[PDB]
Amino acid sequence: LAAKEAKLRDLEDSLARERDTSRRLLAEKEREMAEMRARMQQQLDEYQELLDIKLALDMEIHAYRKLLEGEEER
Amino acid sequence: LAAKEAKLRDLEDSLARERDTSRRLLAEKEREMAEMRARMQQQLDEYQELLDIKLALDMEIHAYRKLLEGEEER
């Protein structure tokens, strides 16, 4: 037990340290991923909102076209 | 060294195992995050593409308005 009960101490220190480092790092990654997933959802919602505006404009242009067709028809 | 050179073996086994588990898990998280960042970029690009279409439609509607104003003006 000359260095055996001494090296076991240095093992448990660095095992505790690795555990701490990897769990804190993982914690950061999950926070960052959840922030990413939230931004992505908001972005899909804003796209859908723009698309609805776009499709309504397409319909207005159809209507103006029809009025113009009546005007110019020979 | 009765159990001291024996428990040091069980320490290095589980330290090697923790290292392996956390590094493979981290690897997955980074792959997943990079996939997320790629989708987010594509999504911002598609939004910008829709917005440009939208703004062109706004201009066409302005133009049709002007034509209609000339038609109806008293």
Side-chain angles (χ1 to χ4, degrees), chain A residues 2-3 6 13-74, chain B residues 2-3 6 13-74:
Chain A
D13 288 4
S14 69
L15 172 79
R17 186 150 128 208
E18 223 114 332
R19 271 157 163 172
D20 183 57
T21 286
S22 70
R23 298 171 184 173
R24 292 197 293 95
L25 181 57
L26 235 317
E28 288 181 51
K29 300 294 170 176
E30 299 293 351
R31 188 218 323 107
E32 192 179 341
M33 278 179 294
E35 291 170 15
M36 274 164 182
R37 288 188 304 262
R39 280 191 246 92
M40 285 172 77
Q41 193 55 239
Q42 183 189 220
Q43 197 60 228
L44 290 157
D45 286 329
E46 284 166 340
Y47 186 93
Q48 192 57 235
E49 176 169 3
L50 186 61
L51 179 64
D52 286 342
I53 287 161
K54 191 267 201 195
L55 295 166
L57 298 184
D58 277 341
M59 288 202 65
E60 295 184 320
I61 281 157
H62 279 308
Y64 287 121
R65 256 177 213 126
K66 298 225 183 193
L67 285 176
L68 217 44
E69 276 160 34
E71 227 81 87
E72 302 280 20
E73 82 120 63
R74 301 170 114 290
Chain B
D13 288 4
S14 69
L15 172 79
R17 186 150 128 208
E18 223 114 332
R19 271 157 163 172
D20 183 57
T21 286
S22 70
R23 298 171 184 173
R24 292 197 293 95
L25 181 57
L26 235 317
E28 288 181 51
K29 300 294 170 176
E30 299 293 351
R31 188 218 323 107
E32 192 179 341
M33 278 179 294
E35 291 170 15
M36 274 164 182
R37 288 188 304 262
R39 280 191 246 92
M40 285 172 77
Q41 193 55 239
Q42 183 189 220
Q43 197 60 228
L44 290 157
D45 286 329
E46 284 166 340
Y47 186 93
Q48 192 57 235
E49 176 169 3
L50 186 61
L51 179 64
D52 286 342
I53 287 161
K54 191 267 201 195
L55 295 166
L57 298 184
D58 277 341
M59 288 202 65
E60 295 184 320
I61 281 157
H62 279 308
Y64 287 121
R65 256 177 213 126
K66 298 225 183 193
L67 285 176
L68 217 44
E69 276 160 34
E71 227 81 87
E72 302 280 20
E73 82 120 63
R74 301 170 114 290

